[PDB]
Amino acid sequence: ENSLPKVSQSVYQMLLNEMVPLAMGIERQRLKIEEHHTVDIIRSHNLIHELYKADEEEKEKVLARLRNIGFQIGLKLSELLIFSNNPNLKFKEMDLLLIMKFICRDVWKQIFGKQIDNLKTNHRGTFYLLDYDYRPIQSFSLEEDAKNEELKMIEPFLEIPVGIIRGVLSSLGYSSEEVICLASFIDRGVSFHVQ
Template identity: 60%
Template sequence: MDAMISPYATGDNATASSVMSEQHQFQLFEESLRKVNILVFQMLINEIIPLSMGLEKKLERANNDELSDKLSKMEVTEGEESLSTVVPTYNTKDIIPSNELIHELSELKDEDKYNKVIDRVRNIGYQVGNKLSELLIFTNNPNLQFKEMDLLLIMKFICRDVWKQLYGKQIDNLKTNHRGTFYLIDYDYQPIREFCIEENALKKELKLVEPFLEFPVGIIKGVLASLGYSKEQVICLATFIDRPNNDIPDTTFAKGISFHVQITTQNNQ
């Protein structure tokens, strides 16, 4: 039953009742939405990397005026327009398989181009993290004030609530020096767990996987931004680490991930 607001309620009571009603309505709306299969969702997340690389290639071609040249050659005679002239035919030969785009990205010599692709992946994660944080707070406790909380509690929110919402599991370990430096350790990061790379993998092989770590980096920075910590205040880096146990299945990625998060709070309001 929806929360009822008394006609005699005033001040804080009326405000609290209104917030509870809106929260309940949102929860009903959320429950009515179609659910996405977890495997499909992980595939969608992983497709962000080749998509970003493909987009960078298209932008590069556009900057070389190839698109302008094609448009200038299109001649449409009045009264004789056809679908093929009004809407140019999409050349399926331009579609590059995702695995080829990932290999191309890992072998890029142009550092500026590589960084543009990585920034795009990270920014997508940033937007997702920013919105997801607001959603989780409103759904669970809209009156929660994170600005008054200790940083450790905020990081626990990321490790527990955010990670579980995205990946169906919590971060495996959280370490801190209690001075703004945190290590979020995920020994079984779900989107790459099916990548079959051996424990003693060469640097070249791990280079293929590195871009996939930038999406969760963006997630972390996006969540922190929604809670009042700007991009300039947050440094987040992801690195491969050894997993603690030796009984790793052959079908599971052999490395864990450590997210090193450093936050400066002196300018935070």
């Protein structure tokens, strides 16, 4: 239908990469940059992500700050989805844990583009969604000596869509939990699991 406002996916996507060394720099707080007013020391983004899992600090307090930031995103976009477009499926108050399949059929296409899911739910008690090529970190690289050492590193990046889909259920009002695995498809991987 209506298609008025547009901004790039790219600068968006690097911002979605860049909430995590932001949070590491929050916890850890010379290139004298703003020398009209002040000075900075440095900010090693290549070593900030090589300080959480490549040095094994107390990131467990910091992981809540990755969890926290998606909630206020996840609370306040359901109303913004009907200002995104108005496709008449947009109403919210008919279903409880059975339009989370379909609110993550759209906002997961509107912050991640694709819709390859293969959803599975045990007796409509717990619903889980998985995809084979996650849009941030399947553009990401390695140090080529192994691969399993690199899957230590990427574990804080998975926690940003914790807060999103937990935000929408708390937008409907909930206290049901959520945990993230990392799958491995066999054809040319990460899974999600909510109660």
